[PDB]
Amino acid sequence: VTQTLMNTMQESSDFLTRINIVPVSEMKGEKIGIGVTGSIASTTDTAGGTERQPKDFSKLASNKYECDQINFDFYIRYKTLDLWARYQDFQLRIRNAIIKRQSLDFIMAGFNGVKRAETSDRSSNPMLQDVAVGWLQKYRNEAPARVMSKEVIRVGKGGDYASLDALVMDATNNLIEPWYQEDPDLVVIVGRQLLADKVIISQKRIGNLPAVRVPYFPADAMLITKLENLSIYYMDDSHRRVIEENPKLDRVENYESMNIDYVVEDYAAGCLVEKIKVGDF
Amino acid sequence: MRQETRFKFNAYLSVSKKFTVEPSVTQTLMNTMQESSDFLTRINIVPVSEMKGEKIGIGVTGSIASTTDTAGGTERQPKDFSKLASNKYECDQINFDFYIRYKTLDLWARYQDFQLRIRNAIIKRQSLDFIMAGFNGVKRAETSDRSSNPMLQDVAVGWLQKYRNEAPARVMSKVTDEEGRTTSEVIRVGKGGDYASLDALVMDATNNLIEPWYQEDPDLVVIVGRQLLADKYFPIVNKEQADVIISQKRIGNLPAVRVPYFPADAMLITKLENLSIYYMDDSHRRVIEENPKLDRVENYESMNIDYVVEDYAAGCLVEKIKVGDFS
Amino acid sequence: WARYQDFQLRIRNAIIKRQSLDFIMAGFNGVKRAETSDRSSNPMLQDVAVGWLQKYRNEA
Amino acid sequence: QLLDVIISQKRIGNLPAVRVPYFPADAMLITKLENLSIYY
Amino acid sequence: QLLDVIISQKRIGNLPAVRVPYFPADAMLITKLENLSIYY
Amino acid sequence: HLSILVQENPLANTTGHQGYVAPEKAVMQQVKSSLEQKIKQMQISLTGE
Amino acid sequence: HLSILVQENPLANTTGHQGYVAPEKAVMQQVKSSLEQKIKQMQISLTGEPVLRLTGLSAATLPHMDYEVAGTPAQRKVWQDKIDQQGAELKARG
Numbered sequence: 001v002t003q004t005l006m007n008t009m010q011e012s013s014d015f016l017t018r019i020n021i022v023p024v025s026e027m028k029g030e031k032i033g034i035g036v037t038g039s040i041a042s043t044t045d046t047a048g049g050t051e052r053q054p055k056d057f058s059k060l061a062s063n064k065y066e067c068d069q070i071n072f073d074f075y076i077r078y079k080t081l082d083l084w085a086r087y088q089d090f091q092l093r094i095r096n097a098i099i100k101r102q103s104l105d106f107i108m109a110g111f112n113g114v115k116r117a118e119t120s121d122r123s124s125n126p127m128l129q130d131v132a133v134g135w136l137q138k139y140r141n142e143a144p145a146r147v148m149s150k151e152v153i154r155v156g157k158g159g160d161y162a163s164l165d166a167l168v169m170d171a172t173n174n175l176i177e178p179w180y181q182e183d184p185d186l187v188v189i190v191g192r193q194l195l196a197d198k199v200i201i202s203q204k205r206i207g208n209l210p211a212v213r214v215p216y217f218p219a220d221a222m223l224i225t226k227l228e229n230l231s232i233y234y235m236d237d238s239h240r241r242v243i244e245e246n247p248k249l250d251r252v253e254n255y256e257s258m259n260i261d262y263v264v265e266d267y268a269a270g271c272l273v274e275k276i277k278v279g280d281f
Numbered sequence: 282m283r284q285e286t287r288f289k290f291n292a293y294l295s296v297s298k299k300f301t302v303e304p305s306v307t308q309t310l311m312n313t314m315q316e317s318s319d320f321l322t323r324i325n326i327v328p329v330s331e332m333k334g335e336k337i338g339i340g341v342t343g344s345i346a347s348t349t350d351t352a353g354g355t356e357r358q359p360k361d362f363s364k365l366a367s368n369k370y371e372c373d374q375i376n377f378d379f380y381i382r383y384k385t386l387d388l389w390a391r392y393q394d395f396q397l398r399i400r401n402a403i404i405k406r407q408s409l410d411f412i413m414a415g416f417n418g419v420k421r422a423e424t425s426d427r428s429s430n431p432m433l434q435d436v437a438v439g440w441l442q443k444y445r446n447e448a449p450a451r452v453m454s455k456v457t458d459e460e461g462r463t464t465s466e467v468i469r470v471g472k473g474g475d476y477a478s479l480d481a482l483v484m485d486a487t488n489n490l491i492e493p494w495y496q497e498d499p500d501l502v503v504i505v506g507r508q509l510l511a512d513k514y515f516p517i518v519n520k521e522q523a524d525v526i527i528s529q530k531r532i533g534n535l536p537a538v539r540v541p542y543f544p545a546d547a548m549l550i551t552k553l554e555n556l557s558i559y560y561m562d563d564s565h566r567r568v569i570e571e572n573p574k575l576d577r578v579e580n581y582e583s584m585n586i587d588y589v590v591e592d593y594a595a596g597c598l599v600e601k602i603k604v605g606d607f608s
Numbered sequence: 609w610a611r612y613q614d615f616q617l618r619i620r621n622a623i624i625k626r627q628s629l630d631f632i633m634a635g636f637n638g639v640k641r642a643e644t645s646d647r648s649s650n651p652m653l654q655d656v657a658v659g660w661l662q663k664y665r666n667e668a
Numbered sequence: 669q670l671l672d673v674i675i676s677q678k679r680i681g682n683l684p685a686v687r688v689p690y691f692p693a694d695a696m697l698i699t700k701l702e703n704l705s706i707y708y
Numbered sequence: 709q710l711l712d713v714i715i716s717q718k719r720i721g722n723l724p725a726v727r728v729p730y731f732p733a734d735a736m737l738i739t740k741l742e743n744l745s746i747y748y
Numbered sequence: 749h750l751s752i753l754v755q756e757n758p759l760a761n762t763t764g765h766q767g768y769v770a771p772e773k774a775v776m777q778q779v780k781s782s783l784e785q786k787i788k789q790m791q792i793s794l795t796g797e
Numbered sequence: 798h799l800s801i802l803v804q805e806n807p808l809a810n811t812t813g814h815q816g817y818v819a820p821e822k823a824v825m826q827q828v829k830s831s832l833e834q835k836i837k838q839m840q841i842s843l844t845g846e847p848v849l850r851l852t853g854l855s856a857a858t859l860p861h862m863d864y865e866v867a868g869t870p871a872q873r874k875v876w877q878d879k880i881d882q883q884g885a886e887l888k889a890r891g
Contacts, residue, residue, distance in 0.1 A: 290610070534671065780825060
């Protein structure tokens with residue numbers, strides 16, 4: 001029954017409908033990967049000689065994922081539950097509000113989070129870190145070959161580069177894979193503190209490929225990849241939802257929990273750059 | 282000349298871009314493979330029905346007109362219509378063969394539409410493999426190992442080695458003197474090297490090496506890898522100031538294309554319909570196997586091909602290109 | 609050529625293409641009307657007819 | 669050199685420039701395109 | 709000053725700038741356009 | 749003038765047919781940058797009558 | 798620098814909000830024009846030891862462009878191959 005809820009949630013937002021989200025029936029295993037492997041062809045002197053031995057397919061290097069639980073909590077004061085009940089549109093307003101909050105929450109947690117520390121607090125972590133491991137952290141965590149730090153880069157005049165176009169060119173030439181380097185879906189996504197005049201599809205196109213911004217990002221970074229290499233795996237049937245009408249505090253409570261895990265599929269058809277600042281000398 | 286040929290010729294007396302013999306199984310697979318990638322679209326994949334013979338002439342021209350005093354004197358001796366430099370191709374087999382582990386297959390079998398995805402994946406895996414093996418691959422050696430040759434340079438002879446061994450004097454790889462047999466090992470291109478820039482290089486190369494017939498032709502391309510293109514176009518964009526020049530990427534007054542895995546230190550100037558691959562009509566043999574000795578389902582597929590560039594005097598390649606300053 | 613399909617069309621198109629190219633080649637070249645016209649010592653068609661770039665250089 | 673048939677966008681002498689397939693590169697001619705003819 | 713309702717194309721702080729008819733010119737405020745309201 | 753006379757030689761421009769900026773513009777941008785850096789790093793002193 | 802400090806004053810820009818070019822670019826264009834005029838009207842003399850010693854024009858000799866059979870290295874290689882062919886042929890003679 002969770003599949004229907006997930007489908008409606010993805011259909012609601014317009015950035016989720018571009019990404020793919022899948023249900024997993026098991027807990028921790030092999031990720032679904034149809035990624036292009038290396039060469040497979042060869043020749044063998046079969047007639048009176050050795051044996052034709054095949055080569056592997058979808059070779060695994062490190063593809064272990066363990067879906068963890070997440071949950072959110074409601075608190076609706078009674079003094080408010082009648083206001084929205086007055087204006088002729090109670091149900092639709094409530095439903096749209098809650099689903100939009102949760103949908104944006106997923107994405108906000110996606111591009112952030114650096115650990116899985118239980119008993120999180122919204123005091124020290126406004127952006128919900130400490131909630132899970134996200135893509136932009138999973139990259140740096142294992143195999144940090146697509147991270148660019150070198151000491152901070154300068155897109156200004158007297159820096160290591162001259163304009164962000166040279167930066168994206170060097171990035172898509174040196175770090176991404178060549179067989180993947182030409183694809184009609186290789187898009188760049190850029191934060192807020194970097195755009196000058198160019199989901200929001202922009203008119204111009206840095207490098208030679210289109211640019212787009214999404215509801216959230218880190219402070220100053222950039223991600224060049226396909227819009228299908230990253231995904232979320234949710235447990236098939238683990239979505240619990242209850243509503244408790246306790247008047248001890250004159251309120252209404254709603255508890256809801258699910259089981260998810262973020263993961264990038266190919267991990268070689270994407271690159272990220274961080275610590276980018278517009279500063280000359 | 283032959284029975285069917287004489288009949289068809291007598292009938293001739295009294296899409297026009299691709300060749301089809303008859304509806305079969307191998308030809309269909311080759312067509313569906315070609316339709317996948319874009320580079321294979323602009324190339325000729327020809328089915329042939331012989332283990333060894335002569336190559337079909339595509340995109341060959343010449344000067345055939347003349348005038349002779351037939352009135353009391355010499356006679357008219359016609360010139361040959363299609364006589365190339367050397368024309369003898371030899372097709373042979375290559376075979377790719379993989380296996381899927383039981384765990385991964387069991388995982389994939391859950392979500393519907395997995396067979397179609399696997400088919401498309403293996404087709405895409407074969408097309409790029411044809412390309413990568415064709416452009417590399419000096420020589421063919423039985424029992425090809427894949428440890429010290431990761432770029433797949435031991436399957437079969439490639440176009441580059443074809444130019445290297447079949448027709449020299451169309452390849453430049455050293456600057457020499459009448460006394461200095463090797464004055465410089467590599468063709469250095471820089472502010473002080475043997476050339477001003479890549480543009481002058483490709484310009485004088487297309488001026489001298491290739492023949493005057495194809496020299497003046499609306500269809501010529503300079504196939505080059507990815508490293509050299511970026512090395513040329515990076516210092517331009519890395520300036521402060523005219524941003525559309527990245528769209529077409531012309532060098533030496535010639536349109537440029539890039540293909541994956543192309544060797545970084547070489548480039549080849551020629552028309553894109555001059556080089557081609559031939560394949561046997563019915564040799565695509567495929568078998569399955571489900572041995573649990575290593576709990577894996579394997580498959581074996583074999584096809585008989587041969588790469589061939591039609592007219593050697595069409596294009597030329599330069600090798601061992603090194604860019605620097607050379608003070 | 610006969611093994612494949614529609615070979616007569618290929619032959620017609622190739623021969624017509626060579627014909628059309630050769631007229632232009634002889635157009636901006638050619639300075640004489642010799643009766644032998646050996647295609648060895650004259651790579652471009654230079655001994656087949658008189659051309660525009662020769663009529664200009666000769667008449668006016 | 670000194671640059672079917674393709675026309676250059678930038679006029680050299682306020683006149684559009686073209687390139688015919690075969691031509692002695694060291695020379696050039698200014699004229700119309702209907703002025704030439706062949707009679708068969 | 710310091711520049712119905714008309715929007716300036718060039719964003720000042722990467723944020724689009726607007727001007728409302730009546731406003732104390734020597735001041736300014738950054739906020740959304742739905743955060744304000746009147747209750748009648 | 750000597751720098752221009754040197755840069756005009758055909759075996760000087762490392763750039764091909766694309767972006768082959770005239771040597772005048774290049775040397776002018778060079779002198780402009782080298783002068784602007786000095787005018788920016790310096791300051792004004794009041795040791796003049 | 799003094800000229801810039803003067804031009805930065807508010808009561809300086811003759812042009813209004815349209816075309817209010819920055820004073821830096823204005824004075825830079827001025828100095829560039831007044832310098833290029835001088836560099837164009839002038840010429841280079843020859844009364845200097847390191848310049849009159851061996852420099853000046855390209856060179857002073859007979860063969861510059863007349864033969865240039867080798868020239869570019871590609872043509873050089875073609876001509877060298879043909880010369881080797883001719884030598885292997887003439888080896889039959891004396």
